[PDB]
Amino acid sequence: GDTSYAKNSAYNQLVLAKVKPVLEQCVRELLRANLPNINKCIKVADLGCASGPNTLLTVRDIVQSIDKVGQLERPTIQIFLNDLFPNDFNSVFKLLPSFYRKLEKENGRKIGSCLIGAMPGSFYSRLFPEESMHFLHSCYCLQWLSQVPSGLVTELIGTNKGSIYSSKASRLPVQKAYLDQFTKDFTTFLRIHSEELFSHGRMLLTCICKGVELDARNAIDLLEMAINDLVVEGHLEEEKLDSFNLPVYIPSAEEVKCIVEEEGSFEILYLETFKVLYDAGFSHIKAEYVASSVRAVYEPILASHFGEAIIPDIFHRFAKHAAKVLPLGKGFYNNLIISLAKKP
Amino acid sequence: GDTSYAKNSAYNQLVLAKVKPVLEQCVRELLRANLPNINKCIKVADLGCASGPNTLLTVRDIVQSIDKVGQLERPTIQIFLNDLFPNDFNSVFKLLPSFYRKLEKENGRKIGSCLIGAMPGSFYSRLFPEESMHFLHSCYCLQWLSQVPSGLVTELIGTNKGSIYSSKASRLPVQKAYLDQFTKDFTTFLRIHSEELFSHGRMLLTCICKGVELDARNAIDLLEMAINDLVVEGHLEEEKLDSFNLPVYIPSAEEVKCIVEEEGSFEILYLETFKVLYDAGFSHIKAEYVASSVRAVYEPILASHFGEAIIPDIFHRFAKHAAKVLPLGKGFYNNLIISLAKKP
Numbered sequence: 001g002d003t004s005y006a007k008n009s010a011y012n013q014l015v016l017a018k019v020k021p022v023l024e025q026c027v028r029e030l031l032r033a034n035l036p037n038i039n040k041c042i043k044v045a046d047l048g049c050a051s052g053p054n055t056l057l058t059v060r061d062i063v064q065s066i067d068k069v070g071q072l073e074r075p076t077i078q079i080f081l082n083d084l085f086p087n088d089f090n091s092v093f094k095l096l097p098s099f100y101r102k103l104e105k106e107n108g109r110k111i112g113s114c115l116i117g118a119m120p121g122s123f124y125s126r127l128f129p130e131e132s133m134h135f136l137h138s139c140y141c142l143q144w145l146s147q148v149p150s151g152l153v154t155e156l157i158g159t160n161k162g163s164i165y166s167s168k169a170s171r172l173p174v175q176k177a178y179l180d181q182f183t184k185d186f187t188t189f190l191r192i193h194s195e196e197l198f199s200h201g202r203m204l205l206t207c208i209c210k211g212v213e214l215d216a217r218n219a220i221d222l223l224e225m226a227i228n229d230l231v232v233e234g235h236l237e238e239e240k241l242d243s244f245n246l247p248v249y250i251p252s253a254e255e256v257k258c259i260v261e262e263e264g265s266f267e268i269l270y271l272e273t274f275k276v277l278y279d280a281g282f283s284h285i286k287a288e289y290v291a292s293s294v295r296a297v298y299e300p301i302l303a304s305h306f307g308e309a310i311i312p313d314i315f316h317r318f319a320k321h322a323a324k325v326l327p328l329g330k331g332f333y334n335n336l337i338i339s340l341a342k343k344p
Numbered sequence: 345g346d347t348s349y350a351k352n353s354a355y356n357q358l359v360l361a362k363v364k365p366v367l368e369q370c371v372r373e374l375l376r377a378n379l380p381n382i383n384k385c386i387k388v389a390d391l392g393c394a395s396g397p398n399t400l401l402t403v404r405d406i407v408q409s410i411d412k413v414g415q416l417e418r419p420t421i422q423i424f425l426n427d428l429f430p431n432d433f434n435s436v437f438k439l440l441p442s443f444y445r446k447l448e449k450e451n452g453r454k455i456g457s458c459l460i461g462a463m464p465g466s467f468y469s470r471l472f473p474e475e476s477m478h479f480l481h482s483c484y485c486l487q488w489l490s491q492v493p494s495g496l497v498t499e500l501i502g503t504n505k506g507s508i509y510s511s512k513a514s515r516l517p518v519q520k521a522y523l524d525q526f527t528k529d530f531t532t533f534l535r536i537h538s539e540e541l542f543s544h545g546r547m548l549l550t551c552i553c554k555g556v557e558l559d560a561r562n563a564i565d566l567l568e569m570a571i572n573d574l575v576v577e578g579h580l581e582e583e584k585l586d587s588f589n590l591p592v593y594i595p596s597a598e599e600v601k602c603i604v605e606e607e608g609s610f611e612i613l614y615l616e617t618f619k620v621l622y623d624a625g626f627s628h629i630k631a632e633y634v635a636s637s638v639r640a641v642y643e644p645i646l647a648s649h650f651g652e653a654i655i656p657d658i659f660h661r662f663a664k665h666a667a668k669v670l671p672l673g674k675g676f677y678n679n680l681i682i683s684l685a686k687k688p
């Protein structure tokens with residue numbers, strides 16, 4: 001589709017390009033760590049696999065990373081694609097036949113040696129039997145909380161005026177509520193997924209993290225500005241904004257690390273941050289290209305609260321704010337890659 | 345949908361009713377055979393899981409059979425649903441949330457202790473790592489061959505006149521070509537799925553098998569009659585019929601057993617045959633109900649060779665032939681259940 005996630009990735013390919021060498025070194029160390037039955041079958045999942053061409057590009061990179069180490073007879077790889085229950089697994093599955101052909105042709109890997117299946121559900125709950133997995137990988141998912149912060153939901157709400165998440169501009173109780181939820185969720189994710197890994201198993205996480213720059217503007221800041229424009233210009237109802245809170249938290253790298261250390265199950269092997277500028281994969285209606293990217297992510301949740309009607313409007317104003325920031329290199333996400341090993 | 349598989353099962357529920365006590369005794373013996381890590385996690389697959397309410401009813405029956413033995417803390421069950429790449433896994437996945445709630449409510453099984461995933465692909469090729477599974481279950485799937493018999497395809501065709509499969513009325517070379525393909529395919533299924541099972545792991549297969557009765561008429565015979573009606577009455581081309589061969593074989597119970605013994609990987613623990621009359625689930629346009637059941641299964645393949653147009657006509661004549669045979673109890677499938685243990 002014209003507006004779909006499948007046709008509106010490609011910034012994601014630049015992220016994946018950064019992850020790749022970390023991934024390769026991560027699996028290199030994991031194959032020499034010699035876990036149970038690893039030279040026979042390696043068991044792997046991707047948590048938050050989504051649906052487009054990008055999902056099989058991650059699998060491709062994971063498989064290539066494992067095969068690269070072969071420099072004996074290739075180990076079987078069993079890969080589980082995880083995502084929520086309503087994800088479009090059907091569209092991924094239909095693409096499998098040609099994908100497996102590509103592997104045979106381009107990679108030397110015989111059909112049946114790479115077994116790709118799905119395990120749907122929340123990655124804040126158990127997905128796999130205790131000590132069954134060698135390697136878990138997640139990219140661009142951990143910003144999504146299990147729920148709107150429970151302080152804005154169970155406690156007594158529309159306390160986050162003019163915003164849709166916790167900015168640096170947000171009131172103290174708003175930041176606290178979002179951090180508390182992140183902390184709960186990430187600690188649960190770490191605990192739960194350590195239980196699934198054999199000892200010395202590994203996780204590789206790539207997450208959006210807080211930018212340092214003053215004047216920097218991420219996609220959520222730009223969205224927030226876009227919606228504020230519509231309330232100020234009479235178009236949107238303005239307690240509709242105050243009652244809208246994304247279930248998203250963008251941590252700081254320091255906050256991610258503290259929680260890993262507090263949780264206690266994982267040793268941190270590697271940590272790095274990197275920016276990707278929103279217009280980096282492009283060729284200045286590059287602002288419109290960015291607006292389409294963000295919409296492919298945020299349209300469903302936005303639509304269901306604000307109505308299908310104002311979305312064109314949201315992403316028109318969005319483009320205007322993007323256009324101001326791109327020429328300065330101020331429109332980006334900052335990112336964090338972290339390699340963990342399960343401690344014995 | 346009105347014509348869909350999901351709304352056109354219920355004969356299948358009678359089959360499953362017959363399978364259940366065999367299933368139960370099968371898993372009872374399996375859990376005392378004490379395979380590797382079986383009291384911690386039991387790994388199970390349903391091969392040819394399809395898409396309707398029936399698919400989660402099989403899962404339900406498998407789970408209950410495992411929990412029934414607990415008469416210690418419930419083992420985790422990891423279940424893989426397998427079917428072909430284009431199957432509607434999406435629709436099954438959307439139902440999983442309520443299904444898991446049902447399990448917690450009605451079964452005492454806490455959420456996260458039953459992990460249901462999918463592994464798509466043909467069950468005549470490898471689906472799981474070697475010696476990784478405890479139990480595989482297949483019902484009503486083994487009729488379906490890997491291809492139209494290679495004799496009628498690679499060799500030099502339109503040799504099976506006025507038929508669509510191998511009847512007892514079929515010429516000798518037709519029966520030979522179909523039996524050769526069954527043998528190849530079923531042998532491959534056994535060999536391939538033994539390799540996946542731990543030693544002493546189990547398979548339970550429920551297959552359509554040949555009826556004994558003269559004058560008995562299964563759904564395929566009735567279809568064949570319906571199509572023959574249309575050529576004789578000028579409606580259908582009549583080399584369209586002679587070039588149409590289903591990739592379906594209905595074996596005799598003796599043929600299935602001989603192949604199990606020859607393949608040599610499995611010990612046969614239990615073998616039983618049973619009939620289900622096509623109108624058994626019904627409180628005499630019961631013939632129309634049967635015709636709809638059969639169409640839900642055979643419409644895609646019929647349509648793509650004969651055209652979407654004549655299908656109403658096919659199933660109108662079908663109903664007429666069904667109506668002659670149901671009052672006599674001559675419209676049924678005969679069925680075979682076989683319990684198998686992987687030999688050491």
Ligand SMILES: Nc1ncnc2c1ncn2[C@@H]1O[C@H](CSCC[C@H](N)C(=O)O)[C@@H](O)[C@H]1O
Pocket residue numbers: 012047048049050051054082083084087121122123124138139140141144146
């Ligand atoms: N709790 C959860 N469990 C599993 N998936 C989740 C989740 N919360 C969010 N997601 C999924 O996370 C995804 C973020 S987009 C996926 C990014 C992708 N891995 C890439 O690198 O390009 C969405 O598909 C969303 O549905």
Ligand SMILES: Nc1ncnc2c1ncn2[C@@H]1O[C@H](CSCC[C@H](N)C(=O)O)[C@@H](O)[C@H]1O
Pocket residue numbers: 356391392393394395398426427428431465466467468482483484485488
């Ligand atoms: N080679 C193969 N691998 C996996 N599934 C197959 C297959 N050949 C046929 N099938 C599937 O087998 C199914 C038969 S209908 C399913 C019957 C179901 N198990 C029940 O008891 O009610 C179809 O869904 C078809 O798509």
Ligand SMILES: O=c1[nH]c(=O)c2ncn([C@H]3O[C@H](CO)[C@@H](O)[C@H]3O)c2[nH]1
Pocket residue numbers: 008009010011012140141143219220278290293294297
């Ligand atoms: O804010 C988010 N949240 C996501 O899950 C997510 N997944 C991918 N992306 C990126 O989508 C665009 C790439 O086509 C890019 O602008 C990022 O916002 C995301 N941005």
Ligand SMILES: O=c1[nH]c(=O)c2ncn([C@H]3O[C@H](CO)[C@@H](O)[C@H]3O)c2[nH]1
Pocket residue numbers: 352353354355356484485487563564622634637638641
């Ligand atoms: O010939 C087949 N082949 C099948 O795969 C199959 N799966 C289910 N059935 C049954 O479908 C009807 C039940 O609603 C019943 O008439 C059987 O044909 C099948 N009949």
